[PDB]
Every structure is written in structure tokens, then in C-alpha cells.
Paper text:
Among these proteases, tryptase, a tetrameric serine protease, is one of the most abundant and functionally significant enzymes in mast cell granules. Tryptase is implicated in extracellular matrix (ECM) remodeling and inflammatory diseases, including asthma, chronic pain, fibrosis, and cancer progression.
The docking studies not only provided insights into hydrogen bonding and polar interactions but also suggested that compound #1 could form a reversible covalent bond with the catalytic Ser209 residue. The experimental electron density clearly shows that the compound #1 is covalently bound with C12 of the electrofilic carbonyl group with the hydroxyl group of the active site serine residue, Ser209, forming a reversible hemiketal (hemiacetal), in agreement with the SPR-derived Kd values. In particular, it represents an example of covalent-reversible inhibition of serine protease. Based on a distance of less than 3.5 Å of the donor and acceptor atoms, we identify nine specific hydrogen bonds of the ligand compound #1, namely to the main chain atoms of Ser204, Ser228, Cys205, Gly207, and Ser209, as well as the side chain atoms of Ser204, Gln206, and His59. According to the above distance criteria, we also suggest the presence of additional hydrophilic interactions with the main chain atoms of Trp229, Ile241, Gly232, and Arg238. The crystal structure of the complex confirms the binding mode hypothesized by docking studies, retrieving almost all the key interactions. The X-ray crystal structure of compound #1 confirmed a 4:1 stoichiometry, showing that four molecules bind per tryptase tetramer, each occupying an independent active site. A comparison of the crystal structures of tryptase complexed with compound #1 and the previously resolved structure of tryptase bound to compound #2d revealed an RMSD value of 0.53 Å, indicating that no significant conformational changes occurred within the tryptase tetramer upon binding either monovalent or bivalent inhibitors.
Residue numbers in the entry:
A (entry chain A), B (entry chain C), C (entry chain B), D (entry chain D): 16 to 258
């Protein structure tokens, strides 16, 4: 996370850390608990190539990475079949846990938005994770969960910005309709925030608008953060995850 | 180049090295001389973001990088306007030299194929360059120009291979119609060969079939090298380069 | 620590972590609390070149580095004036804290040996710290304090081992009389344990025999860990530290 | 080499490159040809631990590293038996080639100084090699042999400078009597120049005064370059090398 602050312990009870087997169980991406048995993440965290499920675990909400790990094994990785790269789109995946988790006020699911919600500019939205605090700058120990409030911008505005300082023709769409844009040169997600949630408070409910997907660096001029637009993939999610 | 050998001095008179300003004029990509004043390369070498022409030079055929440099300034970079990433496609660009080169038997142009030419599967073609000799393995000093014979593979077969061990749906195209495929787990192009030529000898003439574009690593199982299909972009090339 | 285990919370109440100012207060060396206002460490941690006291802090015993830091400022660095390199010797230094520590069962001082004490070969001693777990292998998060039992070895035997597979003449001393030797190819101290204590239980009391100094890598054949011999420098320590 | 310039082809016919077996025969130290069968270098380049001779070769003078290699195998490595570290001293070694080389005006031996020559300040002296051009700054391709004129300073002056900004007591000698000091903040040897020659022209003959040994970084304030003093080790050299 670029800008923002350490999250209060009572905020973001759906935040998860994805861990890869190595010298230790290392954080490589975020996710969100959308069901006691299901984690929502980015496809680019777990694909497009098929990996050994034994090499993956999930960690539920931790204030500080690694200090109190209780790792959960995964039974299934489901990756959107249209996914190949984040810039092409369909950057969305599901992890099925081997067992349902016990939910509480400290650890519980995020609400998915209804199909009609567009998340226009001036919506209050937050992105959370344990990623880099700037381009090529690691989150230092003790690895506190960060949050930052990011301004939403309309896709067409964001598309026009991505074309400034580029050879790409103005008519060749960069920011696609299954994507959502937020952030500026002080407030963004960064490497290690991938797969984590962008959440907006709508009529007193926290809704997941986005999955951290991609950008040209982090907090760079005319290069806002890009997110998988959750409303676009509700029917695909609801094929796997009970309502 | 993976699984290659050092090129004879008399072969590949069209090979060029692209150089970026730093502590020295470092090789970052290949190219081909298609006209005395024009170099053909990959868009991803020089875009999609706009670069300073002052930081770029061209070096014509060298047996060993850096030994006998005579660096040429570039007057214009023309990146295909449909280019954003190599996986989306249109991975092709033109460098206009500030002066035409005086051609010789040692340094001269490659022939572009006719629009009709379909380089059939199995045909023996060659790819050349000063790139890595394996995944994350640098070409050692003294940096000899390398060559490897790579068989052409039909797009449908190559697309099918990229789907093996992948979550991507079989009906979702990975290798697109403006791309061409060559190589196996012993013979491939690699990082630093980007923008360089894939050449095939047809009716006793060397024709440039491909521009080194992308792949999943180098010489990996079921991940052949992907190239920009030159026949696809002949009308765009001929818009700038005299016939 | 090589071949160790995580320390019980009740053990090694004198262990300290030395911290340098940067993007965070990073652990670079160990130390021991020998008096409420004094830390014993290696000269090579803090010399021979003069450093800014503002850039140094001390952290008293913590089970996991960085998690619950309470960083203590240092009023003075005293590096033995005969120190230039660890292999020459006098690898010993004192940090004077700005305030005396309030001692407890969890955090308190280690006992210095009497001048006469000869820690005989084969005696069970312990070395502790947050250093590497093998050659160029970092302690993973969450950075637990580690411990390993290492047998004391006679200087003459240790000197003889350093000469095996070396050009150095057998009559040319490598392990000097102000040094002490411990460890084998399964059990050693390593990079980041420097300045930490080697403690031995004598007549029911923990005595500090050694300060982690140097070696040829960690746990290498015929290259035991070398330590500053504390008994050798008692008169220098007691010049500054009340008895 | 810090400061100075590329050496003319006609200068330093005694300069040698030491090569270690890896992905390529990589330069790690310099040397000097003192006899058709013998190379003079630093002990720290080849010791104190015994290595496999098959992993070492010698390259005689080349203007550009790697471009025209004709590598020579070594029959013997002879390291001063008093050597353990450069700062302790006796930083001197001999390589015996398997065959005598053919000498010419382009490749020939350097003259050793007579026992009485002290090399006082104001002597014109040069140091040569393919080492770093500044602290952690590699010689760029094409790796030209560099030279720099370095001012000699008296041992006592150099010893006093090494004490400025240090804890080491003023009467604890750092610069030892078997060592020689040259350089300033514009002109020095650096990492990769180790084992190479410091040569001074005395009564129209080039004499090797020094072997590149050590320093605190390169061209740093109050830290001139330190060399093994060749006159100190003449009797040891003459045990092995014919006059
Ligand atoms: C994401 O934070 C991000 N950062 O890096 C990535 C890519 C990445 C890196 C490592 C891994 O490790 C997977 C290991 C593994 C092993 C075994 C098993 Cl079984 C499994 Cl499942 C996994 C995966 C993925 N993603 C950032 C966010 C940027 C936000 C900018 N505002 N995204 C990118 O860096 C990025 C992604 C894709 C792009 F096309 C461009 C940029
Ligand atoms: C290509 O060999 C390759 N290798 O690296 C690249 C990417 C790359 C990296 C650096 C640069 O630097 C140019 C910077 C610069 C600065 C100043 C100025 Cl003025 C200019 Cl013009 C430019 C450019 C490009 N490409 C390989 C080939 C793989 C072959 C496999 N068989 N391709 C990739 O590595 C690759 C490219 C694109 C992708 F989407 C994936 C993979
Ligand atoms: C020690 O564990 C060790 N590990 O690294 C060292 C060297 C070292 C590296 C960095 C620093 O940082 C000091 C920075 C600093 C900045 C500001 C301020 Cl204000 C201050 Cl005071 C300081 C210090 C020291 N030492 C190991 C133990 C090996 C045990 C093997 N059995 N020792 C070595 O690595 C070693 C030391 C000396 C040698 F000559 C050789 C080897
Ligand atoms: C020297 O230029 C220098 N630079 O690095 C060294 C140390 C060094 C590095 C690599 C190797 O390779 C060993 C490979 C090998 C493999 C097989 C076989 Cl068979 C053999 Cl024989 C060898 C060896 C040694 N030395 C610089 C010069 C500094 C000049 C400052 N004005 N010296 C140092 O960096 C240095 C040496 C010793 C010190 F105590 C401090 C500094």
C-alpha cells in the first residue's frame, strides 16, 4: 500500500494473505473471505499455469504478517477460463478451503455488490494489504496490514490517462470494461497487494468493488491503479460460491 | 539464444543490436536491417511508453558486442499504434536511422516476405542474437552473436501447447493470428533476443518470417517461442519503408 | 544460529539486539546485558571506524524481532583500542545505555566469569541470537530468538583445524590467546549472531565465556566458530563496568 | 582502477589476469609476469584455503578482457606461509605455469627492485588492472586495461591517516612495515585490481614496488591504497624463482 496507514485491528475482517511454500510460508498476494469456504483473489496470483495445491496456504486476518500464523490448506483453485494476462482481463480466481472457517466479529466475510452498482467517482473506497509501500520498497517488519483511501475515477478518464506519454492509439482501449480504476500519485496499491480487496461503503454496508490487478508501477503520474470489476464476474462467482 | 552456437562472421549481415545510454551503451534488444535507413524490431523493446531518442543507438552486425562499436543515432521510433503488450499483439516497431548505411557483403538488408508467403510447419528457420543462453543465464563475455535452427509450428498447435498445464479455456486464444511460433525444449530465443529476426531460406533467398516477441520463459515444455508474424504487418511496414 | 532451535521465553534474559537506523531499525548484531546500564558486544559490530550514536539503538530480550520493540538509546560506544580486525583480535566493545534497565525474571544481566575460570574442552555451552540459519540463509519471519549447544574446544586444537586445507604455516598462529573456539559442522553461530553471548553453566551459575567474533563461514568442516575470550578482557571491562 | 585512463597497447607488458572456472573463465585478480614460468600475485587472491589448480588459469597481457583469451594452466600455487589476512600482512603468492611463455616486446617480465630501494614520496608510480572504476562500480565492457599514476606516501603518514575517524589506538600500527601506501581521493586501485602491480620508473627501469593488497574502500578520504612491499619478500621470491 502507498500512502495511508496501519489498519485498526477492528477493520477489514475479510482480508487474507496467500502463502507459497519455501524457506518459510511467504506472502505473495492478498485475497478476501467471501464465504466461510471461499477466498476471492486475482487469477494472476495463481495462474494461468496450474500449480501444486500443496505449495499454497491461506492465512486469515493478521495485524502483523507471520507473527501468529495458523495456515489453512486449499482443496481447489478455480481460475476464470478467459484469464491469460491482467492487461487482457478476467483477472479473478476463487480458492476453496478444505474446511469452512468459523466466523466472528474479528474474522468474517465481505459482501459482494449487486450487479447494478457502478461505483462512481466520489464513492468512499479503501484498498488494504501487506504490499510494497512504494515502487521497489518492501513493507518493513513487523509487516502491519495497511489501508489507504483511494479516489475512484471513471474508466474513460483512466483510459485517456493511460494513453498520455504512450505510442498506443487513442482508439485502442487500455482500461477495459471488466476493470475499475482508483488512486493517484499519493494513494495506491503496490506489488504484494495483488488479489486483495477494494471496498466501498454503500448505504452503511461494505461492498467489494474491486480485486487489486495491475498498473504501470504504483502511484505514478497519469497511471492510476487498475482493479478487476467484481460486478462483471458475479455470475461466474455464483456458479461456485453459495448465496 | 538457447541451444545455439556462435555464428560464422559471413552469416546474418542484417542483425542489429539496440543500445540504451547508461554507465555504457548496453544491449537490451535485437533488430534487423530491412532497408539502408530502417531497422525492424519489437514494439515492447521501445514502448508502449514514449522514450527519449537521445538515449537510444543502433549497432550494425558485430561478431562480439562492445569490442568494435560504431554507434548510429536514430531519428524516429515508430511503434505500431495497436501495441500495448506482446500477449495482446501488434508487437512491431521501426527505427529510422539518421543516415542510410553503405551496404556490403558483411552488412546488408534482409528481404521481407511477400504477403502470400505461409512459412509451413517443419520448415528450418534461424533466430539470432546476443540474449540469455538459458532462463536467467546471461550470454558470457566476449558476447558472440549466437544462432539456432528452430522449426516453424502451426499457430493452432502452438496455441494448443500454451493451454496444456493452464487454467485458460481451450476456446480462449493465447497465440493470436498476428503471431508465429517456433522452438522446442532444446532450441529457443530468450531475454535479450527480443526484436531480433526469425529468418527462413525460401527459393534460395533469406526471408524474415518473424520478430522475437514473447514466451513463458525459454525452451520450457509446451511453451514454444512466439514471434510477430511479419506477413501480417507488411502493409504497415510498407507505409513507411520504400519497396 | 546454525542447527539450533527457538529459545524458550524464560531462557537467555541477557540477550540483546543491536539496531541501525534505515527504512526500519534493522538488527545487525547481538549483545549481552552485563550490568543494568552496560551491553557487551563485538568491536567489529560498531568499529573500527567511528559511527553516529543517533543511528544506534538497543532492544532487550524479545522472543520475535520487530514485533514489540522498545528501542533504547546508547550514550557511549567503547571499542577496545587494540581492535582493528577480528582475526588480529581484541574484538570486544561496551555500549553504555542512557538509563539503567529495571531488571526482572524475564530481562536481567549475565554473570562475567572470574579471571581464573578455564572453560575446559567438551563443556556444554550455548550461543544464542537472530543470525543466519546457514551460509547466506536468513533467519525467516517471524525471527524467533534461536539457541544451540556447542562444545568448547581447546585453542591449540582449533588453531590446528584452521591450518588443515590452508597454505598458512603450522607455526603461524590463526586462533590467538585472546580468542576461544566452539562448534562443529552441525552447530555454530553465523552472520547476525556477532557480538552475542556464548554462555556456560558453572557451579549452577550462567557465565559468559565468549563474544561471537568470526569464522570461515558457518558450520564448515575444520572451521569452528571463534569468539572473544571474555576472561582475557575482564580488567578492560571492569575499568568501565562496576563489579 | 579509480581515475586514470585506458593503457596504451605498448605499456605494462607484464600485466596478467587470473581466471576462475564458472559459466566462463572470469577475471578475479591481477598479477605480474616476473619470469617466463612465474606470476607474482596477492596471497588473498588464491588463499589462505587450498583450491583446485584445475579451476585456475592465467591470461597474459590483453588490451580488452575476454576478447582474445589464450588461457595458460598453472602447475603450482605457492602462498607465503605467514599469510592469513591482508591486514595482518605477507599478502604475496607465486603461480608456476605448466610451460615457460615466449617473451616479446608486447609480453615480457617486470624487474624486481633491489633490497635497498625504499620508494619514497615523489617517485612516479603507476598501478594497472581491470578492476572497478569506483566503489561497487564495475569496469564496463569492453573491459580495457586501465592505468593511474598514484602518489606514494610514507608508511608513518598513511598509518596516521588510517587512525583518523577510528577507535583504534594511535600506537596500534595499522599500516605494517611489509606494506606500502599510494593513492588519494582521485587515483586508486579497487576491487578486481588485487594482486596486480604497482610499478615505479627508477634510473630508466620499471621496478615492481608493490602488489595491490587492500584498503578501506577505494579513493576514500584518509584511506590511501595499501600494497604488499615487494622488497620485504625478495628472499622468499628468490627461493622459488630463478635470477
Ligand atoms: C500485485 O501485487 C502483484 N505483485 O506481484 C504480482 C505477480 C506475482 C508474483 C509472485 C507470485 O508468486 C506465486 C507463487 C506460487 C507458487 C505456488 C503456488 Cl501453488 C501458487 Cl498458487 C503460487 C504470483 C504473482 N502481482 C501487483 C499489484 C499492482 C497494483 C498497482 N496499483 N500487480 C502487479 O505487479 C502486476 C500484475 C500483472 C501485470 F500484468 C502487471 C503488474
Ligand atoms: C525479449 O528478449 C526481452 N527481453 O527483455 C524484454 C523486455 C525489455 C526490457 C528492457 C528494455 O529496456 C529498454 C529501455 C529503454 C530505455 C531508453 C530508451 Cl531511449 C529505449 Cl528506446 C528503451 C526493453 C524491453 N524483452 C524476450 C524474448 C523472449 C523470447 C522467448 N522465446 N521477451 C520477453 O522477455 C517478454 C516480452 C514481453 C512479454 F509480455 C513477455 C516476455
Ligand atoms: C557476525 O555475525 C557478523 N555478521 O556481520 C558482521 C559484519 C557487520 C556487518 C554490518 C554491520 O553494521 C554496522 C552498521 C552500523 C551503523 C551505524 C552505527 Cl551508529 C553503528 Cl554502531 C553500526 C556490522 C558488522 N559480523 C559474524 C559471526 C560469525 C560467526 C561464525 N561462527 N561475523 C562475521 O561475519 C565476521 C566478522 C569479522 C570477520 F573478520 C570475518 C567474519
Ligand atoms: C582486490 O582487488 C580484491 N577484490 O576482491 C578481492 C577478494 C577476492 C575475490 C574473489 C576471489 O576469487 C577466488 C576464486 C578462486 C577459485 C579457484 C581457485 Cl583455484 C582460485 Cl586460486 C581462486 C579471490 C579474492 N580482492 C582488492 C584491492 C583493494 C584496493 C584498494 N585500494 N582488495 C580487497 O577488496 C580487499 C582484500 C582484503 C581485505 F582485507 C580488504 C579488501
Amino acid at each position: 500500500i502507498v500512502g495511508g496507514q496501519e489498519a485498526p485491528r477492528s477493520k477489514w475482517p475479510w482480508q487474507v494473505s496467500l502463502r507459497v511454500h519455501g524457506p518459510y510460508w511467504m506472502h505473495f498476494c492478498g485475497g478476501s473471505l467471501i464465504h466461510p469456504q471461499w477466498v476471492l483473489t486475482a487469477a494472476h496470483c495463481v495462474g494461468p499455469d496450474v500449480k501444486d495445491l500443496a505449495a499454497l496456504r491461506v492465512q486469515l486476518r493478521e495485524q502483523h504478517l507471520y507473527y501468529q500464523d495458523q495456515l489453512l490448506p486449499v482443496s481447489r483453485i478455480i481460475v476464470h477460463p478467459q484469464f491469460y494476462t491482467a492487461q487482457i482481463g478476467a483477472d479473478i480466481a476463487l480458492l476453496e478451503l478444505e474446511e469452512p472457517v468459523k466466523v466472528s466479529s474479528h474474522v468474517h466475510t465481505v459482501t459482494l455488490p449487486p450487479a447494478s452498482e457502478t461505483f462512481p467517482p466520489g464513492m468512499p473506497c479503501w484498498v488494504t494489504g501487506w504490499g510494497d509501500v512504494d515502487n521497489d520498497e518492501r513493507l518493513p517488519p513487523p509487516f502491519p496490514l495497511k489501508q489507504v483511501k483511494v479516489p475512484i475515477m471513471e474508466n474513460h478518464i483512466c483510459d485517456a490517462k493511460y494513453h498520455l506519454g504512450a505510442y498506443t492509439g487513442d482508439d485502442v482501449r487500455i482500461v477495459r470494461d471488466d476493470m475499475l480504476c482508483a488512486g493517484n500519485t499519493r494513494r495506491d496499491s503496490c506489488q504484494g497487494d495483488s488479489g486483495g480487496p477494494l471496498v466501498c461503503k454503500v448505504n452503511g454496508t461494505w461492498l467489494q468493488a474491486g480485486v487489486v490487478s495491475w498498473g504501470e508501477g504504483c502511484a505514478q503520474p497519469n497511471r492510476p491503479g487498475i482493479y478487476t470489476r467484481v460486478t462483471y464476474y458475479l455470475d461466474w462467482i455464483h456458479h461456485y460460491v453459495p448465496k
